[PDB]
Amino acid sequence: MVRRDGKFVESKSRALFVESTEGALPSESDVVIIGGGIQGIMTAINLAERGMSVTILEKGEVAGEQSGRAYSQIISYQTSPEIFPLHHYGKILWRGMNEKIGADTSYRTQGRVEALADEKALDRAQEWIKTAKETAGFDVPLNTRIIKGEELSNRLVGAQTPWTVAAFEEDSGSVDPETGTPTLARYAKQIGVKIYTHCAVRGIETAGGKISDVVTEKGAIRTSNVVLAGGIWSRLFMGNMGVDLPTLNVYLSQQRVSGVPGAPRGNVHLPNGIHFREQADGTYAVAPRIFTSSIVKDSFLLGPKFMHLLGGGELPLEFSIGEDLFNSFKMPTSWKLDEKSPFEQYRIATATQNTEHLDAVFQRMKTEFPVFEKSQIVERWGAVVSPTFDELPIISEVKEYPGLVINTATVWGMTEGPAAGEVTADIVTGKKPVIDPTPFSLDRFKK
Ligand SMILES: Cc1cc2nc3c(=O)[nH]c(=O)nc-3n(C[C@H](O)[C@H](O)[C@H](O)COP(=O)(O)OP(=O)(O)OC[C@H]3O[C@@H](n4cnc5c(N)ncnc54)[C@H](O)[C@@H]3O)c2cc1C
């Protein structure tokens, strides 16, 4: 039967609290950034370090939404050719991040073992590793290989299933999302970025093809350069300017369980639906296999491109239908800049957690690794993501509105954030980007 429990709700941040910059909004800024997630913040840092004045506006709290809620494995494994450099260089930048900011983001190089279920999986793993090893950029080699026997069994200590082979990304990363983006926000503030929380951006004023200001709920700020890094809210923001972003929301759930003696370390991914990541604080992040699509207005508006999230393919997908459906039609898609926007109602949006999903993955984890019988649940939460239909982010200028640049629509933003932040800064400043952004352009959606 069809579920009725998936719901979009207002919530609170689960990430470390970041104080707003003191005082009034500035009257002008060289660049204004909409959103205080990892993309807004990493973009701000790259621009500030180039000597520009930068202001971030955040309707709720820093890392209140996706960036504070992520499973947060930092990996390149099985990425496409267009995406791989973003992940490969993301990892490079993360490895230098604590040094850069003189603080601990919680980033750790920990390694990731993915058990492979059969020869077909093994074939696909070896094929990707072969090509990635040959094409790895930025004068840094890939450190991903196949392992087996004694080596694998000790990596997967106490495992009840006879796993024989696995892809091992030895330099995979981990960052605890409660810690990472907030600590980067603090660094941003130290280098002169101004961050104003509880401050929604309603829209952008422009004429003659030049942006003149952004309008917030607390006043306007003059600028000719704007970055929209609004996460799931980017589509809605752009719809009010007559531009369509093809993104569809998906609901997820996550948890933390306590560490136990004799548990495997680092990052484990098994094909029988078991995925955990040891955190810097001793607890384990645990991710269920499944996602839910709550049926809403945009499910019909974007459906043809998104059939892999709406019943086609064999992704682990569950439909849900409820209050969301009717609310999605009541959600305004345009508003004047002098009236209240939907951003001022859902300052810290999330989805209701699915307890059944979280219980099921944890039980599967206890069966496969009996030491976790003595582990208990530390924390549980829900989250919303909003990918494009083509497995590519939107990192692009907006031709219609010179001065506007978008950096959004990724489900790998923890990994990509540092790299995407630099690319976005390059687009803003007119520098030849560190990674060619053609594949991430809005041009791919025209005609
Ligand atoms: C369950 C889950 C697991 C994940 N696991 C991984 C993983 O293992 N590895 C990985 O790399 N990535 C992962 N991600 C992805 C990563 O969390 C996101 O891609 C990334 O956080 C996106 O960052 P962002 O800055 O674009 O968006 P967000 O973090 O959502 O930031 C957007 C911010 O903009 C604000 N905002 C929006 N509109 C306005 C406005 N008009 N005015 C002012 N402020 C506004 C919002 O309040 C929000 O704080 C996961 C995500 C989820 C949900």
- 382 strand-pairing partners: 253
Look-up of token digits 């976790």: 372
Considering only CA atoms, which of 217, 225, 210, 153 is closest in space to residue 407? 225
- 227 strand-pairing partners: 33, 405
Distance of CA 224 from the midpoint of ligand 1 (Å)? 25
Supply 153's token pair.
């069994």
Distance of CA 39 from the midpoint of ligand 1 (Å)? 8
Distance of CA 35 from the midpoint of ligand 1 (Å)? 9
Atom of ligand 1 nearest to the CA of 384: 53
Supply 283's token pair.
């607890």
Distance of CA 242 from the midpoint of ligand 1 (Å)? 23
Query: DSSP E strands: which ranges in 97-148?
Result: 108-109, 112-115, 144-148
Find out whether the beta carbon of 59 lies less than 6 Å from any atom of ligand 1: yes
Find out whether the beta carbon of 8 lies less than 6 Å from any atom of ligand 1: no
Find out whether the beta carbon of 320 lies less than 6 Å from any atom of ligand 1: no
Find out whether the beta carbon of 90 lies less than 6 Å from any atom of ligand 1: no
Find out whether the beta carbon of 414 lies less than 6 Å from any atom of ligand 1: yes
Cα separation, 330 vs 324, in Å, equals 10
Distance of CA 240 from the midpoint of ligand 1 (Å)? 21
Please say whether the beta carbons of 214 and 57 come within 8 A.
yes
Cα separation, 71 vs 159, in Å, equals 22
Atom of ligand 1 nearest to the CA of 252: 1
Q: How many residues does the chain have?
A: 447
Mutate to test the pocket of ligand 1, among 9, 20, 65 (most ligand atoms within 8 A of CB): 65
| Determination technique for this entry | X-ray
CA angle 176, 427, 30 (to 5 degrees): 85
Cα separation, 59 vs 48, in Å, equals 21
Which residue's alpha carbon is nearest to atom 3 within ligand 1? 70
Distance of CA 164 from the midpoint of ligand 1 (Å)? 36
Could you tell me the resolution of this structure in angstroms? 2.0
Under DSSP, the state recorded for 287 is -
Return the biggest CA–CA distance within the chain: 68
Give the CA distances from residue 186 to residues 24, 189, 193, in Å, rounded to whole numbers and listed in that order.
19, 5, 9
Please say whether the beta carbons of 32 and 44 come within 8 A.
no
Mutate to test the pocket of ligand 1, among 67, 236, 276 (most ligand atoms within 8 A of CB): 67
Find out whether the beta carbon of 346 lies less than 6 Å from any atom of ligand 1: no
Considering only CA atoms, which of 50, 45, 89, 55 is closest in space to residue 180? 45
CB under 8 A, 24+ apart: contacts of 425-431: 425/43, 425/46, 425/47, 425/50, 427/395, 427/396, 427/397, 428/31, 428/43, 428/47, 428/225, 428/227, 429/47, 429/50, 429/52
Cα separation, 357 vs 381, in Å, equals 12
